[model samples]
Target: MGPKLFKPSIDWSRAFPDSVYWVGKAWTISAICVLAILVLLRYLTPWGRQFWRITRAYFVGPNSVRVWLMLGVLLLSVVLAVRLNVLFSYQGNDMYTALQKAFEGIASGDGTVKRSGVRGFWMSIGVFSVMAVLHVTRVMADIYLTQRFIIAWRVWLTHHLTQDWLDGRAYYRDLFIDETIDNPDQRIQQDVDIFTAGAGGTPNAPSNGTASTLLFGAVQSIISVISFTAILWNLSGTLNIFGVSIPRAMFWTVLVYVFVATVISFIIGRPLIWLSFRNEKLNAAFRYALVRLRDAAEAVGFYRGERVEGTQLQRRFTPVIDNYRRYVRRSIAFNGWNLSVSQTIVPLPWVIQAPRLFAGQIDFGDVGQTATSFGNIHDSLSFFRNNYDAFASFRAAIIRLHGLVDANEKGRALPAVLTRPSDDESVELNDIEVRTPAGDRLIDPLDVRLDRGGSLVITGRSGAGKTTLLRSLAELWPYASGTLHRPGGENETMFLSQLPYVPLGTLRDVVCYPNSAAAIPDATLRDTLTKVALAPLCDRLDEERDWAKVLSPGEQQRVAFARILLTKPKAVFLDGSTSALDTGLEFALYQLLRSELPDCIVISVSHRPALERLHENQLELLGGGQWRLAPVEA
Candidate 1:
């Protein structure tokens, strides 16, 4: 016969891990009690209520049954995928037992014809190959269904939020009025993105860390613990210590070992939650600052303030890096525990049952089975220890998302700044009080009225509430408490500011803003452009780009006049709308207003004397809540 080959034997003691536990049993047990109590206490707090409301809303909010049904199916697929691990573990024990029997037979030099390394190795290969394929298919199935749920969840939330924010004018409340919510755009994009996909790279389910996948992991973990504990119990047999019989020694050993490991892991990672929260805050703040700098790039460039903005950005960026450094230290500590504990756990069964192995009470197959079962049981129960950081980040995202939803709901439920009609014929402000954001009353209980075809000019010093009073009449102020009677409501009246808000579109859309291009005929558009002395832009009505940047300040103010001409509103409120134009153009602009639209109410706030003769009346604003209304001297 050729040279003989035999099964390999492993030295169990030499195979034990090199490192010791980061924290011993004593401190770990002590930390466990505190962590357990705090965890229980958290469920009784208001934060607990908010947590449920926020997470539950996504699952059962709008399309409850549809989303929940798919979630059930997806989770069931995950459970089936996880159950394959049981077959793998049970087959591993069977293969090792068969291998030991095959090896013992070889000691006698019996003539037996079989595959190399025993027939059990082939069986194991069959099971492992099936598991590998199942794993791939399972991951693909998980992501497919997970993406479906993500789409549905994001769509439902986006629709719900848009209904209140865009359709119900909640953004208007935040934009021109109350300004209570900060970085709403950031929350919509970043926080909600995390809520959907989590930090991503989630294992097993591969569903990008969503709740459905997480719940599946939890279900599988519990089931895995029960399944592996049974196998481990069989191999561990019984332990007689101090003349007392200890039952389910394997289960107790795994429970105690995992309990101590998890407790220390939690203590080391507790601060990571708040640090993670601050990290997200700093990240969003930096992003908002960068956005603000970009939006004001034109203004900043005019003052040669690039150096100043760069310094300011550096100031915001410093804290982000500092928080990250502190977070890294916590990461290192958590990773150390994980590294030592996982390696230590692999050899724990042999180490604990050394007496049974050495005394020939159990063979190598039993030893192998015990170690594998214990490892399975330990890993099953160690879900929290393995994913503590993800939990902290998920919680922070939930809190921030909740704040945004709560603020929006409150803004919608609160009383409006003014009562607006579906339509209006004349504008009236009865004892209106308008205040600045600092709570200083700019216009104190002032009354005014403007009927159709009425011309009124408001003139005041720089600090006087000229712009504030105009906003009050236009019902744009948030903290103003008074009855506003306006004809034709917002659609019937046009409010023009000094720097005209020229939205992105062609020259045609600029003339009929808040209205479509087809609202005005091309011929009339050409005429209005000519009236504003922008006759050269007549052909570029369909030429689209950034019209605001294309046109000068003077041309932009004239574009506002073209918009008013096109809309033919019953009333128009001008707040320094003509300051950019020359004396000749400003004079001709008001003349066109008086002659072209005689029936339109022209209420203007301006320092220019050129508009004084065109209006029949004047409202003067003295600083500190004082005002005077009288006729024009001309």
Candidate 2:
């Protein structure tokens, strides 16, 4: 070894000073108390109940074990944070001393000679290393917890929305009558995800817990400001202005610096909240366009509708472009102001104290230490400025979540007029009349009943209200008045639409969904799939995939039949379910259903000649709300 490096020593007392001692202790105690109070209030308040309900409905509903583990991790993380604060306080004092001694050695033109300067330097290195390690660990913990929380919430929300939309055909009713709830699927899947994920990022984002991360972070910032301000105030001493000595508190300078920055940042960035909300809406609209493009892929290709789709996409993206332009402009303006103020104001404290330093009233260590204190005080005080974007985004997310919650409540409270009678008898629709929202009658008063094990084929020309009658019977169309009697223990009524919903999962799950897939045997599921000409898909019973986009319309119709067979419903309603299939396939499917469940009542709404012989009665819906029943000749 050529030469061992000589390090400087530091005087810890001079760097920390007496003022910071009490402030630091008080800060730590106050922060702990505040955090405890917040956590307690979260669990004890009505808001806490809402959070708990939502959490249970989402996470605990599926995997209680995972939730428990997550909670444990969260608790451990909170403890880690509390312990880390103690370490932060210790490191803070060491860092202040180390910086002071380093500057003192330089000013004195000495290589290494100060009180405990070498030890303080090494301690600072250790503190920095610990901070880095803790920062990375904390980040990883946050990501893991956030991802799990998001998945659990998404699954819960999807189930809830599906039930809300599908139960008693509330979705269909909302589509026809409620324009306020636009694109419920997009809202439920996309917007809800954004809102839930955004909330998870900060404690204030509406979670089941009482203590918000946001509020905690804000408290930390406030405590830091108070602690640092006291240190700076005592250290600054006094100053002279215009030949008259004036005692100026160092914290006042930090406050002025932060207050000016915060006011300006707020003025510049406040508009971003509204802009972000509008941007989210536009993005949702753009997503809708993409969904439409994918759903109508075959039609668009057949009709050569690339131009139409392109124009529509551009229209949807117009708002995005406009909002982005505004965002860029505002961001540029805000940043310019921030940069100008930061550059001009940051060195101001040093300049003000330069005379004292030169006159030997304060050492180089005091000057350096004061600079650090000033910076800490300013940063803590300007917490709002630093977190403006997060704050704005949070507000926007709140508005969206509130809208979704309100809509969900309204959907649950919708009136149900037609009650099912308690008896296993014919489904009778007496004096039923259905009308559109604009007061146009779609179905006139008509008395009809299909006895148990009886079948009816509804026939009508285009625009003759055949589908509306099915909707009314299903109690989906509330703009109708009727006494519709089903039967007791008849919860086994199944409806097959032209386009059936295909859930994403294993083939067995998709087929037996709305019921647990594991509840049914594998062999029985395979038999049903084979009966509906879907035996080829039996091997994919465990493969989770998006089956809707993969399968053709006819294949999907066959899958619908498979579901009906597995369900073994007492009554089955087919609304153009076989229209996409060829005449032979349609006949075969009906024959399979009829042969398997001979006692099950079947109602078909079709104009296809192939389905005419399968039913015992024919109900014709004429234009202008007229209904006539005739005997079918098989």
Candidate 3:
């Protein structure tokens, strides 16, 4: 008593009257009550709960059996964990009792022994060994199982969306006709990773994680509650807060305490959840800006507007940083509350039963055992409180994914501008009119036909819907009305756009685009490149790089020509395709197409009147919805 001990002011706290602690505990209760209500409402909203849609669409869904086996493999570790948690809790209670019993004997001046202490020390050592093995196994299981799910999940979801977009060139409609989606490459990449990355539940039972990562946690929590509740209930006895009465009181007390803690944690953390969602948008936007810059680097560099671009990009990025600061501050405040409440909960049971211990209603060892068991059940119910930030991030991911799904659903239903069926090799348009996405008409009800082995030229003034007419032909325009029939299946008719898409890859891959170089013979690929006067690249077929950067606008056009020669389509649509080339190269390309494309039908759209020489028929789109399909004076 003479020596100074830690916290002399709080020394009298122990064995103090219940009123001393109870009087100031009002704040905890108020916070708990308010928080619970807030969380209850948060989870019920469409935005908050959108995550379940992935589970409904993919995971635990139609391909449920595949996932079920994967799920079972993951659950083995959880089963191990469920048993270990309660076992550790039970071992802890026993250790405390033995230690107290040894103390009691020492205080009574019994030099006979630290008998119970030896037994406690030996038993607890074995318990810790089991705990250590269980912990590492749990981590291994998570890493291994998550890897497996992502492999299947990535391919499964990718094929699902990719097929719809690729089928019938439907992606063209999504971009032009429906105009419902954007950032196709990035969305699919990020969406697939995130969808499978979701990480959650129980049985005779333990539980398993996304795509139920929360699902596994949720079920794990139940496993915890159902399994450990029995452990705590048997040891903790009845509840007696403020002298209240209830059967199996300790069981109810553990549940009630955790219930309130969860409520308060959520209330404080709800602000973080919203901030997390916003932060995700900001992060994604930042990434999109950089990706756009990368894709359009040549364009921006040609303009030499780096400074202006920098200013604009910075403006776009500032909100992301500013919002991030607020998000961090808000999260810090919420986590402070979370850590404080969760920690206080650690030693709460002993404090609650202090009165009973002092009055001799319970032994010192019994109090410790009760506290140990109560803490187990209490911790079990706090899964959300622990990983709340992750859940908030996941909420934003769910929304982003839902957005893409919505766009897909909408795009899939859009009516095509033209429908094709296999028949005689011909292109026919009957009473077909082209218009804007709005209802304004462009090419008024014009009928035209081009038989295989024939050629036609289409000429129009700028803004006369020349491109829109082309779009209508390819089933890419939504704002058109009339019946257009294509005899060949899709892909048999090729398009050479003004600005060809030269994807990043080897020269060979670019030459044989939409078909891998391996799919096309090297000899044929080299022959096609040489025929296009791009034989310099023939030697570097396997050399990989961004071909867009290496090839000039003129070279890219040649690549398009080369691809067409390789495909050898019967009907080819040219939309200002030779604008960048000189008259000499343009003639050579048209000659190549004419010679190589067997039964070729060329639909030409160009300001170059030189193209008029290649066709005996023409469609003239005059403004004010006037159009004529007439034979030229060949």
Candidate 4:
């Protein structure tokens, strides 16, 4: 007892009555409650479940170990950054205290002081310079890690969605089933970008600025709140107001202030979700209109219909502008409320501590520390309030992405015509029936078989299910019941439509649509182009152009024939593939097939009676679920 090692003012017995134990227990309970709430939302709510379904793959599937590892380091860096901020608060305290002491020493004009004020000031500055360098390093590392993580996430998600959207002919099936579904391209392109980029990014320009928000916005905020709340509780001892005493007054005051602000902010910004959703939808429609106009520019020019096109485009643009105006008005109210609340809280801590300072209960350093901690606590508690609009936009994007995935699932689940690969060189349709999406039968039950080298021409009036039968055979139409045996692999068979799809690329790629130009040698391609009467354009194969717009209808059809000759599929189904060509060109193309690949099967849908001369058999679709099959007339 000669030299006391502890403070004598506080009675240990009175303060040690489970106060520390209770504090630990309270924090443990809070953590458990937060975790429980997150788990419940993740597994129970429809919206949360939808979000999980769409995003679980990247977090839990293959290569997830790499993702999780990067996330661990990223979160560790975030914690370190928060610690730096806490250190900065203390540094501020020391800086302000040094200035106060230096001024006091100067005013006193005394040779004696607690320490050399000038030395203390310079030491604090040195400390700040060191911390500043570390802070900059942390920031650089944060940006690099965040960018890599975002790119990895975006690549995986894009590939996953593309696979599900395109496989099993789901893209084609979506058209007949869900008329309400619009702009899946936008959903995949824009919505995925928004969701991954979080609040700080747009559809076109992705930024790593808000990557922290996606990974640990809430967690980081919670850690910051706890750390600063502890500082605040320790610094603010007590306050008396209106004959009433409050313990940890600053802590409780900040808590209540932020809670009230959050409630008000949510109320003010609740409609932002719907507004953002509507705005995206309207803008997408406008973009679609513009794209359609661009695609048909030549036709519009021919018809001189600029006025009509302009009117249609303007009609679409009007809704986009109207929706955006409403969104801006709502945002004004939200931002106004936010600014009012945030600005008023800036001086609250200083005001609360001024009285205590006057009473000489604490020094200027204590007041500085309290004010800084109070601000931190306020910021941590107001994270949601500050980001409410961003959360709304993110939720809207999630809903859109979920909608697209659901549509693809439903489209793929539609009943399909059972197609089995043929073992022998033959095509067989056993008691097959084709129907519209509404289950209205288009073609009656029929059984037909054709061996390799067999040629058949199908003839019918417009809308008599001539092309519909071709669609069924190709497995593009799902409202059908029966078994058809055809080639198994995609490259083993070819289905050429009336308007041959000319994809974007060089003319060589257009000739080999859906296949790489490298698959066939240049000499063979040149010979096939010559055989198809497209020899004049053979030298320009390497030229990149919109072949669909550049080539005439007849030339595009010839490109389709060149593709068939290059690949030499076992079977070919033509749906008006030669409608744009004259009788001589069409006859020559069919003759070339017989001479080059005599073992291949040729099935054509055409209105030309002259085509019957080349085919060994004919099938004429009579109206009202009727059909005829017989040998071609000589």
Best candidate, TM-score-wise?
4
- C-alpha lDDT values of all predictions: 0.66, 0.64, 0.64, 0.73
Q: Please give the distance, in angstroms, between residue 622's alpha carbon in candidate 1 and its true position after superposition.
A: 3.5
Off by over 4 Å in 3: 1-66, 73-76, 89-155, 168-170, 175-186, 199-213, 230-255, 264-272, 298-302, 343-363, 384-389, 420-425, 514-516, 519-535, 584-599
Model 4 Cα shift for residue 511 (angstroms): 2.4
Per-prediction TM-score, please?
Answer: 0.82, 0.73, 0.77, 0.87
The parts of candidate 4 lying over 4 Å away from their true place are: 1-41, 95-109, 114-119, 201-214, 437-441, 487-490, 632-634
Q: Ten residues in a row with the worst lDDT in model 1?
A: 15-24
Candidate 1 per-residue lDDT, tens place, 1-634, comes to: 1223333233223321311231133234434464485468558986566765555556545757776567556545644544666555555565665565566567866545233447656656765676688777776666666677666666666566556566555676655434465677767755666676645322233445333344456656665565556566556657766887888676776677888888889888888878888887787788888777765668877799778777988999999999989889988989888889888667667767888766767655667766666666777787868877777777777777787767766665544356665244667667777777776767667777776668888777887666766665554456667786666544776787755687776666666888886866665567667777776676756776776556677667777777777777776677887666677767777778878877877777777667777788887878777789888674
Q: Which regions of candidate 2 are displaced past 4 Å?
A: 1-28, 31-173, 176-216, 240-245, 488-491, 499-565, 577-598, 608-618, 630-634
- For candidate 4, the lDDT comes to 0.73
Q: Give the alpha carbon lDDT tens digit for every residue of 194-216 in model 2.
A: 55554432332433331234544
Worst 10 residues of 2 by lDDT: 1-10
Give residue 582's error in model 2 in angstroms: 7.2
Model 3 over residues 441-532: C-alpha lDDT tens digits? 66667677667678888787887677766766666666667776676764677876656687676666666776666777665556666777
